[PDB]
């Protein structure tokens, strides 16, 4: 009602002012994200506090479990920056879905770039619903009704507090804190009803059937090949590029898109929200 | 060394359990399997009452249930849950609970053998309390640390046949002498795996206090309980694992980290519960 959408689909432009508790309703902005999957909230130059207000409208904000990622003044904000003492450098250099490995993966991720060097820095996205669409049934039907294991443990980053600890003690703590997790390999989006190939080049280790039996490991390899996630040059037709622009908030559906960083001083703030629907989705 | 595990995590399947060659299994082997996966199925072992006990004693020190009306006719060690006349007690565990959570030494391991199951929709729900804790933001989490929770079983003690015609006040008074309320730290650290466990029970945990006796805001217990999934009357929480009974398949699990309840012909199960000599239920966190 209050927001105007230019375009349709990945990258649609939305024309949001820091006084948003007014006409911006939660159902308005959700239906926009569900519909287009990735949108840009144009030229919002919000303050940290206003960002959070926008996040809370979108849904229930979840702070990142690991506090070295937290903004100095707000636990809610996950900070990626090249600048010493501001969050963590070089986050997300690998395909992933946010909190794909936690008990409640997010419904929405939102990124505000506060400082970008140049015009070629941003994020790659892959539509896992489209990837699924292009799959012939002969490759498709072995994935249905199977269970995928997602293992984050090797990607947990060493923290400043970890220096001089024996690596085995750090690993042991990781293993207690974020063990591998299982999700259905194919899920059905609780809102749109689309079927989603919920697998990740970096994190998905193996597929098993509904009785524990190991699926032919070339199935996982073949599905992963068809997502485009293994193309080291990033030319797959399934790969959308979204370039960062300062003050342009990138907001997207974290069930249906897989993403990774594309690549001066870079600094971005991030908020992640739940939507109260089945996460990541129903088994398909 | 002698056993092979299919899968990993809740419901993993174990194949090398031979009723006649049970002494092939070392204690450390089968313990590390249970600690690691939390819930396992020992497949197609159709043991005799006597062999079940042997399996139990390999696992650890068997503790018979304090109340004898639950006992197997011939073996005190075995807790009998059955729909059938004169066999143990009907309709046990129809509520979320940890076994002997209310006693001075809660079990490390619970083991169940189904002898007769009607259909395919009967079994046990499990909730991984380490996972529940994992999903809690610190803002909800840190007020629970270092607190003490009261667990009160008295209203759930079942009327026994010996109790008929007694005035209810005398029965209650005896319950109150026998199983009073007990206190455990609200957040526990598993003495073996080291995981932190939200050790609270919808039916049994009445109140939280700090380590000076002061009552914590009752909203804290209420909101921790909501986040466990135990209050979802339709059992659709992502934290809820379903395990269906199969005759001859022994379900064996870590009674520190899982909270469980019954998922509702003739049903008859045998149960054995063991200590492991480690701090029970765990260290305070
Ligand atoms: C299972 C796939 C890999 C998990 C990566 C975990 C570290 C990252 C943060 C970073 O890249 O430093 N997690 C961010 C999130 O999941 O939201
Ligand atoms: C804190 C809640 C305690 C209630 C359990 C008391 C009866 C049950 C047996 C039954 O359900 O009839 N005790 C089983 C056990 O603790 O092992
Ligand atoms: Fe990310
Ligand atoms: Fe029980």
Indicate if B13 and B120 belong to the same structural domain.
Answer: yes
Residue B217: both structure tokens together: 């805001």
Binding site membership of A100 for ligand 1 (Cβ less than 6 Å) = yes
- Within a domain: B285: no
- What span, in angstroms and rounded, lies between the C-alpha atoms of B145 and B136? 12
Closest CA to A261 of A228, A223, A234, A236: A234
- What span, in angstroms and rounded, lies between the C-alpha atoms of A273 and A42? 20
Three-state DSSP string of chain B:
CCCCEECCCCCEEECCCCCCCHHHCCHHHHHHHHHHHCEEEECCCCCCHHHHHHHHHHHCEECCCCCHHHECCCCCCCEEEECCCCCCECCCCCCCECCCCCCCCCCCEEEEEEEECCCCCCEEEEEEHHHHHHCCCHHHHHHHCCCEEEECCHHHCCCCHHHCCCCHHHHHHHHHHHCCCEEEECEEECCCCCCEEECCCCCCEEEEECCCCCECCHHHHHHHHHHHCCCCCCCCCCCEEEEECCCCCEEEEECCCEEEEEECCCCEEEEEEEECCCCCCCEEC
Indicate if B107 and B160 belong to the same structural domain.
Answer: no
B271 touches B79 (CB < 8 A): yes
Total residue count of chain A as it appears in this document: 284
> Closest approach of chain B CAs to the CA of A261, in angstroms?
26
Task: Domain count for chain B, please give it.
Answer: 2
- Within a domain: B284: no
Helix (H) or strand (E) holding A271: strand A267-274
Q: Are strands A239-243 and A5-6 parallel, antiparallel or unpaired?
A: unpaired
B67 touches B171 (CB < 8 A): no
Total residue count of chain B as it appears in this document: 285
- What span, in angstroms and rounded, lies between the C-alpha atoms of B25 and B18? 9
Indicate if B80 and B94 belong to the same structural domain.
Answer: yes
B113 touches B254 (CB < 8 A): no
Q: Are strands B196-198 and B187-189 parallel, antiparallel or unpaired?
A: antiparallel
A108 touches A62 (CB < 8 A): no
Binding site membership of A98 for ligand 1 (Cβ less than 6 Å) = yes
- Within a domain: A284: no
Burial pattern B224-245, b for ≥16 Cβ within 10 A else e, equals bbebbbbeeeeeebebbbebbb
B132 touches B140 (CB < 8 A): no
Indicate if B59 and B105 belong to the same structural domain.
Answer: yes
- Within a domain: B261: yes
Closest CA to B28 of B58, B64, B66, B61: B58
- Within a domain: B146: yes
- What span, in angstroms and rounded, lies between the C-alpha atoms of A73 and B219? 26
Render A123-140 in DSSP notation, one character per residue.
EEEEEHHHHHHTS-HHHH
Indicate if B113 and B249 belong to the same structural domain.
Answer: yes
Is residue B95 packed enough to be buried (19+ CB in 10 Å), middle (13-18) or exposed (0-12)?
middle
Using the 8-state DSSP alphabet, how is residue A249 labeled? E
Count of CB pairs separated by less than 8 Å, A with B:
38
C-alpha A57 chain-centroid distance: 19
What contacts B213, CB < 8 A, 6 or more positions away?
none
Q: Within an 8 Å CB–CB cutoff, is residue B237 touching chain A?
A: no
Q: Which residues form ligand 2's pocket by a CB distance below 6 Å?
A: B 89, 92-93, 97, 99-102, 151, 153, 156-158, 201, 203-204
- Within a domain: B98: yes
Residue ranges of E strands in A45-188: 60-61, 78-81, 108-115, 122-127, 147-150, 181-184, 186-188
Helix (H) or strand (E) holding A173: helix A167-177
- Within a domain: B22: yes
Indicate if B105 and B195 belong to the same structural domain.
Answer: no
Indicate if B109 and B25 belong to the same structural domain.
Answer: yes
Indicate if B262 and B220 belong to the same structural domain.
Answer: no
Q: What does this entry list as its resolution, in Å? A: 2.0
- Within a domain: A196: yes
Indicate if B134 and B90 belong to the same structural domain.
Answer: no
- What span, in angstroms and rounded, lies between the C-alpha atoms of A124 and A240? 6
Angle at B16 between CA B11 and CA B20, to 5 degrees: 125
- What span, in angstroms and rounded, lies between the C-alpha atoms of A10 and A283? 25
A223 touches A139 (CB < 8 A): yes
Residue B245: both structure tokens together: 């009974």
- What span, in angstroms and rounded, lies between the C-alpha atoms of B257 and B251? 15
Burial pattern A95-104, b for ≥16 Cβ within 10 A else e, equals bbbbbbbbbe
Nearest atom of ligand 1 to the alpha carbon of A202: 2
Indicate if B86 and B146 belong to the same structural domain.
Answer: no
Q: Within an 8 Å CB–CB cutoff, is residue A177 touching chain B?
A: yes
SS3 of residue A41 by DSSP: strand
Q: Within an 8 Å CB–CB cutoff, is residue A102 touching chain B?
A: yes
Residue B221: both structure tokens together: 């217990």
Rg (CA), chain A: 19
Binding site membership of A152 for ligand 1 (Cβ less than 6 Å) = yes
Residue A130: both structure tokens together: 């489209």
The backbone torsions φ and ψ at residue A86, rounded to the nearest 5 degrees and listed phi first, read -120, 100
A103 and B139 in contact by Cβ < 8 A?
Answer: no
Domain of residue B32, CATH code: 3.60.130.10
Residue A83: give the domain boundaries: 5-275
Residue B114: both structure tokens together: 């189904």
A75 and B194 in contact by Cβ < 8 A?
Answer: no
Residue B212: both structure tokens together: 């000076």
Binding site membership of A50 for ligand 1 (Cβ less than 6 Å) = no
Indicate if B105 and B172 belong to the same structural domain.
Answer: no
B137 and A63 in contact by Cβ < 8 A?
Answer: yes
Is residue B124 packed enough to be buried (19+ CB in 10 Å), middle (13-18) or exposed (0-12)?
buried
Closest CA to A31 of A275, A273, A281, A278: A275
Residue A36: count of CB within 10 angstroms of its CB? 21
Burial pattern B57-91, b for ≥16 Cβ within 10 A else e, equals ebbbebbbbeeeebbbeebebbbbbbeeeebbbee
Q: What is the largest CA-CA distance in chain A?
A: 57
Using the 8-state DSSP alphabet, how is residue A5 labeled? E
Indicate if B61 and B167 belong to the same structural domain.
Answer: no
Residue A148: both structure tokens together: 């995928």
> Closest approach of chain A CAs to the CA of B154, in angstroms?
34
Rg (CA), chain B: 19
Q: Within an 8 Å CB–CB cutoff, is residue B238 touching chain A?
A: yes
B12 touches A212 (CB < 8 A): yes
| Closest alpha carbon within chain B to A281 | B238
What contacts A247, CB < 8 A, 6 or more positions away?
A43, A44, A45, A112, A113
């Amino acid at each position: 009602m209050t927001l105007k959408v230019k375009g349709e689909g990945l990258g649609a432009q939305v024309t949001v002012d820091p006084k948003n508790l007014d006409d911006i309703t939660t159902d308005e902005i959700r239906d926009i994200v569900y519909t287009n999957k990735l949108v840009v909230l144009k030229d919002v130059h919000p303050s940290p506090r206003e960002f959070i207000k926008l996040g809370r409208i979108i849904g229930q904000i979840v702070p990142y479990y690991e506090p070295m990622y937290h903004h100095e003044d707000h636990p809610e904000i996950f900070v990626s920056s090249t600048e010493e003492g501001q969050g963590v450098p070089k986050t997300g250099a690998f395909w992933h879905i946010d909190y794909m490995f936690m008990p409640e993966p997010f419904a929405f991720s939102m990124v505000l770039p506060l400082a970008v060097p140049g015009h070629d820095r941003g994020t790659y996205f892959i539509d896992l619903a489209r990837v699924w669409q292009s799959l012939p049934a002969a490759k498709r039907d072995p994935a249905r009704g199977t269970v995928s294991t997602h293992d984050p443990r090797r990607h947990i980053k060493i923290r400043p507090s970890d220096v001089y600890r024996p690596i085995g003690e750090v690993w042991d703590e990781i293993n207690r804190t974020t063990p591998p997790i299982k999700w259905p390999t194919v899920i059905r989006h609780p809102k749109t009803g689309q079927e989603i190939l919920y697998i990740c080049a970096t994190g998905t280790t193996k597929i098993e059937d509904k009785d524990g039996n190991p699926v032919d490991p070339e199935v996982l390899q073949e599905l992963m090949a068809a997502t485009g996630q293994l193309d080291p040059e990033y030319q797959s037709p399934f790969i959308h590029t979204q370039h960062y622009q300062v003050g342009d908030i990138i907001l997207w559906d974290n069930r249906v898109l897989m993403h990774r960083a594309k690549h001066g001083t870079l600094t971005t703030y991030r908020l992640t929200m739940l939507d109260g629907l089945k996460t990541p989705g129903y088994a398909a």
